[PDB]
Coordinates of C-alpha atoms in Angstrom, one line a residue:
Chain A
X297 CA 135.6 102.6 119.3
X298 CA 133.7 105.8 117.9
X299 CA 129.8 105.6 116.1
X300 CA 128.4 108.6 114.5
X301 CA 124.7 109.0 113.8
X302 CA 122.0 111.6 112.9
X303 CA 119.5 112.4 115.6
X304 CA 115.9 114.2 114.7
X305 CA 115.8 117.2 117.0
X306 CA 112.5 116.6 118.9
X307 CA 112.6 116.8 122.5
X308 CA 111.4 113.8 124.6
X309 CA 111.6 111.6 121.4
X310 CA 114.0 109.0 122.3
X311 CA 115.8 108.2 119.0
X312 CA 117.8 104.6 118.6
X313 CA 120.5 103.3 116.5
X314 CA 122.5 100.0 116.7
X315 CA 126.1 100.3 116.5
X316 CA 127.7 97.9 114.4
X317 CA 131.3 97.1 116.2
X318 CA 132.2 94.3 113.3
X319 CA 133.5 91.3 115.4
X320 CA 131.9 92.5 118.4
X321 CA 128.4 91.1 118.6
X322 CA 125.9 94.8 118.1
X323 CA 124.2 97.1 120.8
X324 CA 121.6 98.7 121.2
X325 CA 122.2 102.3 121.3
X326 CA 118.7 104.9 122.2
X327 CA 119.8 108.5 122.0
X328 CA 117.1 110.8 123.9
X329 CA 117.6 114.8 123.9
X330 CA 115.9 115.0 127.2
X331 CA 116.0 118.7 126.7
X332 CA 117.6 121.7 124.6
X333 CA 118.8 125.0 125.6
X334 CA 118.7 127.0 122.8
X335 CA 120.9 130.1 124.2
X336 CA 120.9 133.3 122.1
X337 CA 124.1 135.7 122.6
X338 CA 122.9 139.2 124.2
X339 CA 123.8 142.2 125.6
X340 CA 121.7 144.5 128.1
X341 CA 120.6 147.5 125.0
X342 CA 118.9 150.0 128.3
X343 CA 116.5 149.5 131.2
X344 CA 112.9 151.6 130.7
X345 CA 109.9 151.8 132.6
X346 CA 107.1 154.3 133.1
X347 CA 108.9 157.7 133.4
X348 CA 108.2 159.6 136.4
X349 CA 107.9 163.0 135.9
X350 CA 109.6 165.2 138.6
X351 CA 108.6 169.0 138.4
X352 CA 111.3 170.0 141.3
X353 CA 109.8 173.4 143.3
X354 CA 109.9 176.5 141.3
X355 CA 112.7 178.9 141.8
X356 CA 111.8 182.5 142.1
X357 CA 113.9 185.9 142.2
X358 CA 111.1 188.2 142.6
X359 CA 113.3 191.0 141.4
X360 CA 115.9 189.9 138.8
X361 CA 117.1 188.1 136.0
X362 CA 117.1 183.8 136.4
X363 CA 119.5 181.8 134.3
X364 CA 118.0 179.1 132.1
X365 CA 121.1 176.7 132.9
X366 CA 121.9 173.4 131.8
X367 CA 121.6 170.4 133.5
X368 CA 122.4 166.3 133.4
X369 CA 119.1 165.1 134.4
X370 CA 116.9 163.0 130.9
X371 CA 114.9 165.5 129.6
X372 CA 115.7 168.8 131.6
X373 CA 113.8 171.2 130.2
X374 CA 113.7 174.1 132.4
X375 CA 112.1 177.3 131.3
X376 CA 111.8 180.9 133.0
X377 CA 108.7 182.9 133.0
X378 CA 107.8 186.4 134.2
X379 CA 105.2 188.2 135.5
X380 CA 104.1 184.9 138.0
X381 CA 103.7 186.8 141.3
X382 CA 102.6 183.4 143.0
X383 CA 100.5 183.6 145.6
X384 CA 101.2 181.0 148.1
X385 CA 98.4 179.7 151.2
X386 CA 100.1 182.3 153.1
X387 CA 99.2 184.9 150.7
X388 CA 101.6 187.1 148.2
X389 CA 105.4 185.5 147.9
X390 CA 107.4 187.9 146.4
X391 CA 109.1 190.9 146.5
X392 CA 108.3 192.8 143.3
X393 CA 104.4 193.7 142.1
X394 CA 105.9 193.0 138.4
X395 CA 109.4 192.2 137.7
X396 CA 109.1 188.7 139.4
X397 CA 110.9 186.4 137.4
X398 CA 110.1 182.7 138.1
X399 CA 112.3 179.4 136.8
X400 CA 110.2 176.1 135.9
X401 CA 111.7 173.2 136.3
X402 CA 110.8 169.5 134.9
X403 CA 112.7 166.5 134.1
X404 CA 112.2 162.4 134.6
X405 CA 113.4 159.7 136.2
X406 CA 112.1 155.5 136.9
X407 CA 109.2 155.3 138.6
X408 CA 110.2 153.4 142.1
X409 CA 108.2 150.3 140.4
X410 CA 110.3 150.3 137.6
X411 CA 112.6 147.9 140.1
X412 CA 110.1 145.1 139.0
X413 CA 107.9 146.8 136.5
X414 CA 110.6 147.5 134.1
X415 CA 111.6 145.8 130.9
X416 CA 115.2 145.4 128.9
X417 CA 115.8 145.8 125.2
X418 CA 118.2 143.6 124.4
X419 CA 120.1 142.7 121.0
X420 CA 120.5 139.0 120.0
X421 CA 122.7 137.1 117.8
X422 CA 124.2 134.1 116.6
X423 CA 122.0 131.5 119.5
X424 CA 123.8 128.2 120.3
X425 CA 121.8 125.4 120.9
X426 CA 122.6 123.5 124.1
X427 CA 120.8 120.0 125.1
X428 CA 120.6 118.0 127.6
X429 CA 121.2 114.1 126.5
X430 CA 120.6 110.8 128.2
X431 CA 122.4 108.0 126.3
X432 CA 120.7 104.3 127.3
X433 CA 122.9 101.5 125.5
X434 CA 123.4 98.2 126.3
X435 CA 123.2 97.2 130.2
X436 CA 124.5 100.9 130.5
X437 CA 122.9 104.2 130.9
X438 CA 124.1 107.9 131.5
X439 CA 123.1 111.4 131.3
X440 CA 125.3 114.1 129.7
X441 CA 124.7 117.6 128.5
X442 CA 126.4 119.7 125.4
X443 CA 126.7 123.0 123.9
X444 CA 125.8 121.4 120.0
X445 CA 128.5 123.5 118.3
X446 CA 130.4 120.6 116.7
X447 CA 133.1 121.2 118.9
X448 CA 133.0 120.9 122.2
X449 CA 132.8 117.7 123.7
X450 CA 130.2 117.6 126.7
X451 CA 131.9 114.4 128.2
X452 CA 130.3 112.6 131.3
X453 CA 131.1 109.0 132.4
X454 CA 132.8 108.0 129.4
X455 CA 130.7 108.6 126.7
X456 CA 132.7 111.0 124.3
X457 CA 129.7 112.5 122.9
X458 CA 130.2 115.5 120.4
X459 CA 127.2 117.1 119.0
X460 CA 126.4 119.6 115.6
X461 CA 126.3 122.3 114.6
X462 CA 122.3 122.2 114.0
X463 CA 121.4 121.0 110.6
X464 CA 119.7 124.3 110.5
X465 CA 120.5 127.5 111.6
X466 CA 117.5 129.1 113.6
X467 CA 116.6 131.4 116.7
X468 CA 113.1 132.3 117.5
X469 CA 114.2 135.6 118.7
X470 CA 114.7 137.9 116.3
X471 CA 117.9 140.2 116.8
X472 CA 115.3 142.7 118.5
X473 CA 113.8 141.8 121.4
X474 CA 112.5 143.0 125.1
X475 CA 112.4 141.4 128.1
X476 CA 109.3 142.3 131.0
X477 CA 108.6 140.3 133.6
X478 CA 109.6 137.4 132.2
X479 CA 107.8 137.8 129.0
X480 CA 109.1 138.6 126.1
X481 CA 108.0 140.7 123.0
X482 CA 110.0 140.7 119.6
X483 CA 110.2 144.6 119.0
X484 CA 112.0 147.1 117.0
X485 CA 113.0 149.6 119.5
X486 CA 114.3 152.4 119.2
X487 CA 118.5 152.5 119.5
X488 CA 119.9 153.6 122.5
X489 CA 119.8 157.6 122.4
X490 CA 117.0 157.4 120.2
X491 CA 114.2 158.6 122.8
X492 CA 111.0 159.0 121.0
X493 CA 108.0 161.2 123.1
X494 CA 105.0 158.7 123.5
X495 CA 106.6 155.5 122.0
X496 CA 108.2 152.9 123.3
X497 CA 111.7 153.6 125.3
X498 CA 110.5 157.0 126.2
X499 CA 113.3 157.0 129.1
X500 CA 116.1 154.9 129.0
X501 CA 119.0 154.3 130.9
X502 CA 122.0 151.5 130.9
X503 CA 120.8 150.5 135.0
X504 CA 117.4 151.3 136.6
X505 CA 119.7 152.3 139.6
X506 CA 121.9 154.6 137.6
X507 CA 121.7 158.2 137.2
X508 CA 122.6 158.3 133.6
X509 CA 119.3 158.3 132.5
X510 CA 118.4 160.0 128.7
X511 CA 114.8 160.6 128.2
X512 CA 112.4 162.5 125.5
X513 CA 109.1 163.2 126.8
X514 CA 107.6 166.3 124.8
X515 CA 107.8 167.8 128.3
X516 CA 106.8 172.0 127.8
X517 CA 105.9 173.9 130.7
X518 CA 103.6 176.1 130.1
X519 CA 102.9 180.2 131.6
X520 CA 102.4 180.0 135.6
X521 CA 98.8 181.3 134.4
X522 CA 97.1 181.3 137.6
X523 CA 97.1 182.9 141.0
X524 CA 97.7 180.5 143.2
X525 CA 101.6 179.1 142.9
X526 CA 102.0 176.1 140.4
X527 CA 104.1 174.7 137.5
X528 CA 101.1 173.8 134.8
X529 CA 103.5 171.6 132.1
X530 CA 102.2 168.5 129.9
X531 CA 103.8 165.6 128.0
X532 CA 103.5 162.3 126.0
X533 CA 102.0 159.3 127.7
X534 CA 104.6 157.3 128.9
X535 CA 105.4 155.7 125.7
X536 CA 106.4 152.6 127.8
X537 CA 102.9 152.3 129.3
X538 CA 101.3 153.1 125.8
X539 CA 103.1 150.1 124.2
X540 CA 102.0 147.7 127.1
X541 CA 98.8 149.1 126.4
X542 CA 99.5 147.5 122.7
X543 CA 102.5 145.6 122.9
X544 CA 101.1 142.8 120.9
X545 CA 101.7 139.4 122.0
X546 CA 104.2 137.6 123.4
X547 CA 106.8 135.0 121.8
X548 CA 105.3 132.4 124.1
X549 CA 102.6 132.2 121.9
X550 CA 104.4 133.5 119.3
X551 CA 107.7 131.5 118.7
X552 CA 107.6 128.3 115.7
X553 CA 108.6 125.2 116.3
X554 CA 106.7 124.8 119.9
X555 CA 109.9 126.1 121.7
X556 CA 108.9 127.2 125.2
X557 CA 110.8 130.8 125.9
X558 CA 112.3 131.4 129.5
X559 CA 114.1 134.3 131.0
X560 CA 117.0 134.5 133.4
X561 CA 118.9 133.9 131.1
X562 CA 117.0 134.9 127.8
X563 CA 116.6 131.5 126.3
X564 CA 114.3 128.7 124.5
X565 CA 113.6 125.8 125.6
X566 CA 112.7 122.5 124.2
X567 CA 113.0 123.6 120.7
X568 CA 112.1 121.1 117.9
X569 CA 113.9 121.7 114.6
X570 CA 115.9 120.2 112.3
X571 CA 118.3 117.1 113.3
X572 CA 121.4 116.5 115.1
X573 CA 124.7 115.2 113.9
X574 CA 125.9 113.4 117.0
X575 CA 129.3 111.2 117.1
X576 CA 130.1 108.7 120.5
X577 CA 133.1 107.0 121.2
X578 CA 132.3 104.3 123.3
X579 CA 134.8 102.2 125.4
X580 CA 135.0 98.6 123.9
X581 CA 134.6 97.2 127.2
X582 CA 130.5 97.9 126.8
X583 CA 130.9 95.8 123.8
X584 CA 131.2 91.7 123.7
X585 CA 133.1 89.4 121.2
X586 CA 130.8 87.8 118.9
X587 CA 131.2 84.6 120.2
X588 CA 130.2 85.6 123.8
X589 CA 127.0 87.1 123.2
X590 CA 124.2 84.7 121.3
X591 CA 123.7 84.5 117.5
X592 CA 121.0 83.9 115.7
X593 CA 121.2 81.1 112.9
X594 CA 117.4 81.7 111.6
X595 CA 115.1 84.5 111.5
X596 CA 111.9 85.6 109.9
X597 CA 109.4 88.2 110.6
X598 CA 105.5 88.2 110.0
X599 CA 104.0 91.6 111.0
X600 CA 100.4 90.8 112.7
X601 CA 98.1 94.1 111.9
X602 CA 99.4 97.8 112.5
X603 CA 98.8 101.2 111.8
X604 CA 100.4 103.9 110.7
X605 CA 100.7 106.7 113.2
X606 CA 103.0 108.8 115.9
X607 CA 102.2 106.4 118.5
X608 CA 103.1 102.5 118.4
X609 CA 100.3 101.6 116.1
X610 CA 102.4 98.7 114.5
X611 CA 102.9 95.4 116.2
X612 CA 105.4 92.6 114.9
X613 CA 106.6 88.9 115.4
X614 CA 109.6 86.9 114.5
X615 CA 111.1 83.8 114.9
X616 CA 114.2 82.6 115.9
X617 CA 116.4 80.1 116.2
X618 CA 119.6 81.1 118.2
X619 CA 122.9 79.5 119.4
X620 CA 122.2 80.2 123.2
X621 CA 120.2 82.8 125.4
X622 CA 120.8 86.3 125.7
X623 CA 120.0 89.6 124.9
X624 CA 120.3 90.1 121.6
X625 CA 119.6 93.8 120.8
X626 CA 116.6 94.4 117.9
X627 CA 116.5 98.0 115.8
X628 CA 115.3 99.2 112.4
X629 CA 117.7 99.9 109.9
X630 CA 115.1 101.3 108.2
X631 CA 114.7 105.2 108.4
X632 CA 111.1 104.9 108.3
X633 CA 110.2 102.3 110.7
X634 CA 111.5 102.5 114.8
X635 CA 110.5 99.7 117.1
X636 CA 109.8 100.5 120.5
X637 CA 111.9 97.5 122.7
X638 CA 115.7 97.6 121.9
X639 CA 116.6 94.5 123.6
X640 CA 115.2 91.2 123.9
X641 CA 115.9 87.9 125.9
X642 CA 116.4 85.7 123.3
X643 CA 115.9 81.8 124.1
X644 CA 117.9 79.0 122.4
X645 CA 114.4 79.2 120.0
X646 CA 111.0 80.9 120.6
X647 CA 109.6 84.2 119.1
X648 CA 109.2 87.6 120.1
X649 CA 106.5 90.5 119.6
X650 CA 107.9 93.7 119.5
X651 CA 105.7 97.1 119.2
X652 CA 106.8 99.9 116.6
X653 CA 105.8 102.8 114.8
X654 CA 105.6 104.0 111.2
X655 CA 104.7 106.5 108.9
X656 CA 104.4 104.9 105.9
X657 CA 101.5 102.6 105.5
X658 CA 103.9 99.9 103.8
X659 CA 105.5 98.2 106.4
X660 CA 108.5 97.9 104.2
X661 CA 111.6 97.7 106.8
X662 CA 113.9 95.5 107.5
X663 CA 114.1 94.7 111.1
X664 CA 117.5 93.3 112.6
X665 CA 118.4 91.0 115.6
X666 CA 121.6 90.3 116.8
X667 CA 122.9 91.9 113.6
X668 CA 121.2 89.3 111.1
X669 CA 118.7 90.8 109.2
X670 CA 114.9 90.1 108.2
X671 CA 112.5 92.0 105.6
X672 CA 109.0 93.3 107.1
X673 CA 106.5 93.8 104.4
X674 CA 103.2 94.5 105.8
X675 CA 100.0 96.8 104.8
X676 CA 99.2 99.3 107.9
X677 CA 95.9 101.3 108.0
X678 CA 95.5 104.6 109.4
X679 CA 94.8 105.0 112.8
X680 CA 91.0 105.9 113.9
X681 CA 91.6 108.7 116.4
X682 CA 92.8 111.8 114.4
X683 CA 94.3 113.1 116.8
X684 CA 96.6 112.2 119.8
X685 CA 98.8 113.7 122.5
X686 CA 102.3 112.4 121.2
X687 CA 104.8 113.6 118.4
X688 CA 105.3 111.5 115.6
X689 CA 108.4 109.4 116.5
X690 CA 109.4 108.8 112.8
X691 CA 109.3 111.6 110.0
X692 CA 108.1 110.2 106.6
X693 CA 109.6 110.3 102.7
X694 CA 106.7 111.1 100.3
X695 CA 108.9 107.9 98.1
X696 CA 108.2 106.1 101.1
X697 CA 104.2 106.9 101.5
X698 CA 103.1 105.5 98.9
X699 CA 101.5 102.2 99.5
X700 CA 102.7 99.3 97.5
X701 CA 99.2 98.6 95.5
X702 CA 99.2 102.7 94.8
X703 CA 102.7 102.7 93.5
X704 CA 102.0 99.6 91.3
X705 CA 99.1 101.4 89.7
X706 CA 100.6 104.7 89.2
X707 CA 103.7 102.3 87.4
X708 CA 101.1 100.5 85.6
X709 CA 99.6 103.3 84.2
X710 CA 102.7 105.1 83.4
X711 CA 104.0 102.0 82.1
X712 CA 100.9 101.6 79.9
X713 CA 101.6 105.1 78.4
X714 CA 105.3 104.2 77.9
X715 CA 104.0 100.8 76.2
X716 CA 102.2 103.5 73.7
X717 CA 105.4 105.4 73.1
X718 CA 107.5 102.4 72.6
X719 CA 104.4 100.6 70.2
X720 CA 105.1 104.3 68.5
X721 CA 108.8 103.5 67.8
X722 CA 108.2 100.1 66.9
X723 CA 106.0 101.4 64.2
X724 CA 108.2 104.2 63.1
X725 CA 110.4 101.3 62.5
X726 CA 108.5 99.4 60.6
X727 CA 106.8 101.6 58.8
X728 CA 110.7 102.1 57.1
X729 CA 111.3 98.5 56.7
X730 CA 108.4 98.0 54.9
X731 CA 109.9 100.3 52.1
X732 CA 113.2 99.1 52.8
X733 CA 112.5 95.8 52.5
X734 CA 110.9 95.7 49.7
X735 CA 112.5 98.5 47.2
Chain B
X268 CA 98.2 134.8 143.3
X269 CA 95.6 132.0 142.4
X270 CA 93.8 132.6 139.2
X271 CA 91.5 130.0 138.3
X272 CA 91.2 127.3 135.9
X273 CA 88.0 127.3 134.2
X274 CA 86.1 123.9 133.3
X275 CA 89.0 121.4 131.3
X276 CA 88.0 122.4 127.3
X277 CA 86.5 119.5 126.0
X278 CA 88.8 119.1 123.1
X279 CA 86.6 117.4 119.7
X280 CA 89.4 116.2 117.5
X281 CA 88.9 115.7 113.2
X282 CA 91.0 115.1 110.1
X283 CA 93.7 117.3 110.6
X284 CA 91.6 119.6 112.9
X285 CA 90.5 120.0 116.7
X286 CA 87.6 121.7 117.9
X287 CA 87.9 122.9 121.4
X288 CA 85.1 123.4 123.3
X289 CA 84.8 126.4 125.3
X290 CA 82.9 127.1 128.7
X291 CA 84.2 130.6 130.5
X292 CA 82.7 133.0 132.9
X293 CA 85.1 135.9 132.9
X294 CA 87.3 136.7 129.6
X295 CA 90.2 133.4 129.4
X296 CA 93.2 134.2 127.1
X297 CA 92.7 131.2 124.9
X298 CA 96.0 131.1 122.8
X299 CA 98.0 128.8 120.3
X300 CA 100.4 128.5 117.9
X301 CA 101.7 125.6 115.8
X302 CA 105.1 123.7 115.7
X303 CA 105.5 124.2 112.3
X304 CA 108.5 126.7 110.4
X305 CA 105.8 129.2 110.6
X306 CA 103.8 129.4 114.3
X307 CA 100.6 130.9 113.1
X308 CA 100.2 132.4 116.9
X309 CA 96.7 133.1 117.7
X310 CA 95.1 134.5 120.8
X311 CA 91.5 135.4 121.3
X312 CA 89.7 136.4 124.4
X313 CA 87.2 134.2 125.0
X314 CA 84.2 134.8 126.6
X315 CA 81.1 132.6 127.7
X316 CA 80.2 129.1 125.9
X317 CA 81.6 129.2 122.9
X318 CA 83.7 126.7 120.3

């Protein structure tokens, strides 16, 4: 037999649910995302790193013509000047006292850091959300794990769990971003090929070991103009190094809904948004007949004090009076309200006291054990501490919040003006039947 | 590497509102965001006693 339930996405929150298997006495069923694995799609955009400039030893034919050629290398930019007659430490190195032509020569390549200090541009689309479930029900527990598509069924054991898609589509990464170190920085960059000098991806290339690197620098070299031998040239900062230098900061402490980003593969974990649609055929077996498991003939339930908060503020009793001992399973039905035990020893007759939690300051819920049902109806004040270090384990419905005396006097005095409006027709009536009645 | 931990901020909490308290030698990259649809990052170097 197959159940079907919603699940708030919030990680460590252990959600519950009672599945209702008609003649078969009810269980418990807690469904806790022990993690997600929000996965984004990508593909490796190009490496870049700080480009090291390489001004290879100048070529010189002291007495003739140099050709400017063409080569592969990111950025080649070789230029030939005349007149250098460089001298070297030895002295004088060339043949001619004037027609010395003299090739400069400059072009880039990674840094031999760039093996760590490097970072990736990488485009992202279309992220799946993966999670990591463990599914407590009954006398039974297991673990299982499931790409939330909708589709594809993450069996383990024999739970037949199914899960999604998201009830919202999200990604924290936008479709731009760039990996470094670990860290990661949401960034337009520029597209491959689109090298800008002394901006980020200044050199790029598609591996930091390949040599099928593209690059735009600005690099100009400039007139040998001095005596002793050299290749005076300039250049951008490496863009790369001037957007570290003002990167901005990292989705870590950038990214919404608290989800913790992670490299290796590019993904976020823990995410918290939206809910889950999850579905679990369970084999009858876990189940009992009716008759098997105890009954309860007579309930009732008198909440003792609670408060309205994320933790279990709320505290509750009820009474029974069952057909044998057992463990009866105990839930909410109620959105609003979750109680903390799922099970309880039930004795031929006794009570329990079970802690929950709310968000509405009516206690209005309806509690259920052993499938029979009992109405809660209790007034809970807010907690004292403003602050504490759990999520809320029960979102709330502004229909739901307000408290029972508030929504009898905002229907009181709404019900007062509609008494006006209505006194208003009664005398537009009568007004006519007074000429009516008497013509 | 170690890198150090400075002095556990003494966290004041308030409707709807915490104030951390702050004690730092050398600058400490306080930062924080929220869980919320938008994540409001913030990140200030801190620097000395300070809230």
């Amino acid at each position: 037999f197959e159940h079907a339930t919603t699940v708030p996405n919030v990680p460590g929150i252990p959600y519950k649910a009672l599945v209702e298997r008609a003649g078969y006495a009810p269980l418990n069923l807690e469904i806790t995302v022990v993690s997600s694995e929000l996965t984004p799609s990508t593909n490796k955009e190009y490496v870049t790193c700080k480009f090291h400039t390489v001004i290879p030893s100048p070529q010189v034919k002291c007495c003739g013509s140099l050709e400017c050629k063409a080569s592969s290398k990111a950025d080649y930019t070789c230029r030939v000047f005349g007149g250098v007659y460089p001298f070297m430490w030895g002295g004088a190195q060339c043949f001619c006292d004037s027609e010395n032509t003299q090739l400069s020569e400059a072009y880039v390549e990674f840094a031999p850091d760039c093996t760590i200090d490097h970072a990736v541009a990488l485009k992202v689309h279309t992220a799946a959300l993966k999670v990591g479930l463990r599914i407590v029900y009954g006398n039974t527990t297991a673990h299982l794990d499931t790409f939330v598509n909708g589709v594809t069924p993450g069996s383990s054991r024999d739970l037949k769990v199914i899960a999604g898609p998201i009830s919202a589509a999200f990604s924290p990464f936008d479709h731009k971003v760039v990996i470094r170190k670990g860290l990661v920085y949401n960034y337009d960059f520029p597209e491959y090929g689109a090298m800008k000098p002394g901006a980020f991806g200044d050199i790029q290339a598609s591996s930091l070991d390949a040599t099928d690197i593209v690059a735009r620098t600005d690099i100009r070299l400039l007139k040998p103009s001095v005596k002793n031998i050299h290749v005076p040239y300039t250049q951008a900062v490496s863009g790369y190094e001037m957007w570290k230098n003002n990167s901005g900061r990292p989705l870590q402490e950038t990214a919404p809904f608290g989800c913790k980003i992670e490299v290796e593969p590019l993904r976020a974990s823990n995410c918290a948004y939206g809910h889950i649609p999850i579905s679990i055929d369970i084999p009858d077996a876990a189940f009992v007949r009716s008759s098997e498991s105890p009954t309860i003939l007579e309930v009732s339930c008198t909440v003792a004090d609670c408060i309205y908060s994320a933790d279990f503020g709320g505290s509750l009793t009820l009474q029974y009076k069952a057909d044998r001992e057992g463990h009866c399973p105990v839930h909410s039905h109620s959105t609003t309200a979750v109680l903390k035990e799922a099970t309880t020893h039930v004795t031929a007759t006794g009570s329990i006291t079970l802690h929950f939690s709310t968000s509405s300051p009516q206690a209005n819920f309806i509690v259920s054990l052993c499938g029979k049902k009992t109405t809660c109806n209790a007034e809970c004040k807010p907690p004292a501490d403003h602050i504490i270090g759990e999520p809320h384990k029960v979102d709330q419905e502004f229909q739901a919040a307000v408290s029972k005396t508030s929504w009898n006097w905002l229907l009181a005095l709404f019900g007062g003006a509609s008494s006006l409006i209505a006194v208003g027709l009664i005398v537009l009536v009568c007004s006519s039947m007074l000429i009516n009645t008497r013509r | 590497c170690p890198v150090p931990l400075a002095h556990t901020p003494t966290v004041t909490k308030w409707f709807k509102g915490i104030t951390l308290h702050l004690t730092a030698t050398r600058p400490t990259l306080l930062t924080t965001r929220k869980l919320g649809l938008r994540a409001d990052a913030t990140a200030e170097w801190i620097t000395g006693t300070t809230s």
